[PDB]
Amino acid sequence: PGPELSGWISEQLMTGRIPVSDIFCDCYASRQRVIPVYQVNNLEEICQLIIQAFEAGVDFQESADSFLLMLCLHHAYQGDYKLFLESGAVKYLEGHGFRFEVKKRDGVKRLEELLGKNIKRTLTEANAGQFLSFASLFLPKLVVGEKACLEKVQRQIQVHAEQGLIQYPTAWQSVGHMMVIFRLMRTNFLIKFLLIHQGMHMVHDANDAVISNSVAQARFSGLLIVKTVLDHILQKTERGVRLHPLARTAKVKNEVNSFKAALSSLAKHGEYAPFARLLNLSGVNNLEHGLFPQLSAIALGVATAHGSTLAGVNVGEQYQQLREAATEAEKQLQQYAESR
């Protein structure tokens, strides 16, 4: 402790970079992302308050990770902080740049005690499992959009209620509550990862069965167009599978080199690759189908020759000739194979 001798804080206050009211309030001013792990005796009691705050539509901002972690720790780790801080999920998050700081706090009655003063100013039929499994339903269509995502959430709720697997409070099924979850899911890496890691790595609990089904349905979400383009530029032969000969022409070289580079970066994520758009994993932005119009035209060309379309592939006027050349090449390939 002591005086702020670097002159950094005073420089920031004087130039408008740190608000004056952050230090002079009627309070404190603050590589790795530090997550406070709140160690309590009344975990189930705290979890019910967290759920209640989400139902009321509270935006925890920087505090969201801390409370969402408490819900995961309660449901998936029974309240065992040691089992959790040792888990492969924490090992991944530690490597990903997260730092878990345990904070021992007992006799907590309000969420305000654990805690941006708007959060403390603003301060259930369901459990921690239901909150998490309800959030998991957003994973298959989260990257597409709200409409598509909320329609996928709605159909899946009906499927799980009909199968007799799970039921959620009716108040959660409002567009308003669904939106709150959508916004939370869009911004929060921790919850999305925790859900994926669980759905990925688990061998009865109705919520866990919902989480697993959601994670399987979310495989390659936001990567399905580029995946189908890859399928249609790969050519299965008697010698094995090769790149389509049109992808090997001079005009396509620079594009096929970028594709190869972006595909290598995705492949480095291994078992996580199928969730790279969901988790915004390194290099995923380089693997967008719109970046490869020639490969998309070859792919659509090959599909057209078999009387199929490729959903999401829009071939512009500039790439129409390559698409037509690919349809013809495919028609010819089938002819020289039918005679054999």
- Three-state SS for the chain is CCCCCCCHHHHHHHCCCCCHHHCCCCCCCCCCEEEEEEECCCHHHHHHHHHHHHHCCCCCHHHHHHHHHHHHHHHHCCCCHHHHHHCHHHHHHHHCCEEEEEEECCCCCCHHHCCCCHHHHHCCCCCHHHHHHHHHCCCCCCCCCHHHHHHHHHHHHHHHHHCCCCCCCHHHHCHHHHHHHHHHHHHCHHHHHHHHHHHHCCCCCHHHHHHHHHHHHCCCCCCHHHHHHHHHHEEECCCCEEECHHHHCHHHHHHHHHHHHHHHHHHCCHHHHHHCCCCCCCCHHHCCHHHCHHHHHHHHHHHHHCCCCCCCCCCCHHHHHHHHHHHHHHHHHHHHHHCC
Domains observed in the chain: 31-218 (no CATH), 224-338 (1.10.3050)
Q: Give 36: exposed, middle or buried? Use CB within 10 Å, 0-12, 13-18, 19+.
A: middle
Rg, C-alpha atoms of the chain: 25
Q: Which of 6, 21, 325, 278 is nearest to 149 (CA)?
A: 278
Contacts 24+ apart (CB under 8 A), 77-85: 79/43, 79/44, 81/37, 81/39, 85/37
How far apart, in Å, are the Cα atoms of 254 and each of 163, 257, 268, 293, 294? Answer: 50, 5, 22, 12, 10
Give the integer Cα–Cα distance in Å for 17 and 34.
22
* Contact assessment for residue 333 and residue 310, using Cβ atoms and an 8 Å cutoff: no
Give the integer Cα–Cα distance in Å for 42 and 107.
8
* Contact assessment for residue 138 and residue 154, using Cβ atoms and an 8 Å cutoff: no
Interstrand relation of 98-104 and 234-236 (parallel, antiparallel or unpaired):
unpaired
Give the integer Cα–Cα distance in Å for 37 and 81.
9
What are the backbone dihedrals phi and psi of residue 195, each rounded to the nearest 5 degrees, phi first?
Answer: -70, -45
Q: Which residues of 140-176 are buried (b: 16+ CB within 10 A; e: fewer)?
A: bbbbeeeeebbebbeebbeebeeeeebebeeebbeee
User: Which technique?
Assistant: X-ray
* Contact assessment for residue 139 and residue 221, using Cβ atoms and an 8 Å cutoff: yes
Q: Which of 278, 128, 266 is nearest to 189 (CA)?
A: 278
What are the backbone dihedrals phi and psi of residue 70, each rounded to the nearest 5 degrees, phi first?
Answer: -60, -40
What is the stated resolution of the deposited model, in angstroms? 2.4
Helix axes 320-338, 293-305, angle to 10 degrees: 40
* Contact assessment for residue 37 and residue 100, using Cβ atoms and an 8 Å cutoff: yes
Structure tokens at 222: 């936001």
* Contact assessment for residue 280 and residue 189, using Cβ atoms and an 8 Å cutoff: yes
In the chain, breaks (C-N over 2.5 A) are found after: 26, 30, 115, 123, 203
Q: Give 230: exposed, middle or buried? Use CB within 10 Å, 0-12, 13-18, 19+.
A: middle
